[PDB]
Amino acid sequence: DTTCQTAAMILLNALVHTSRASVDCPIIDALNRLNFIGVLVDSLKEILNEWASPSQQYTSAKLALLLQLCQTRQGAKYVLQANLFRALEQSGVFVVALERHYALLVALARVVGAAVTARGAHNIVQGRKFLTQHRGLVVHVLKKNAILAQQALEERIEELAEAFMLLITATGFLEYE
């Protein structure tokens, strides 16, 4: 089904969200035991094929959920062990049509950005490789930011530009030079 999977995916976001407000959580732990996080990271591959349209809105909730798990300290452990760096590489993902394109890059950048700065110095080694292996692309975004559809497009650039900036200061790429 197309609507059941969408509502179910968005439902999990509310469960984990309200659970944190109640440093750990039993909801996120159960998802790992049920092999949900495993298959979820596997579906990240070939995301370009999936991405108003029903398939587009479905992917939004998918990446949105992963972003929430990377905010808690315990999520970095289970999420990092899923080897998400190699999953987003096989897909080769890295006026209104362009706005949707940046929306996908922002969603992925936030998941990776929050994940590295979640655990600590155990994930910085991977962040440096992502910026070095994909260098240049981020440079174009950080320099671009430096009528309705136009403002919406520029807004995504600001979020996208600030997304990588958080990973840089959090990963310590300046020290590498």
């Binding site: 939004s60 440079v139 320099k143 200061t169 300046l174």
Partner: protein
């Protein structure tokens, strides 16, 4: 007047109602997720180094 003036039928009326409800639910969920993410980022960035994080790059990278 009556008997139809840019109107619809009940079978289509209920379908349009359901579609509108679904679209509104999806929009509300997306907006709430965006607001929660923005609040989280504001709480995590308001600690310290608000402008230095970008100044270091503006000084390192080409302005």
């Amino acid at each position: 007047s009556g008997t139809g003036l840019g109107e619809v039928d009940v079978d289509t009326y209920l379908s349009n109602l359901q579609t509108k409800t679904t679209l509104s639910m999806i929009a509300d969920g997306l907006e709430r997720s965006a607001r929660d993410f923005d609040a989280f980022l504001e709480e995590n960035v308001t600690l310290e180094w608000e402008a230095q994080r970008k100044r270091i790059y503006q000084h390192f990278g080409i302005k």
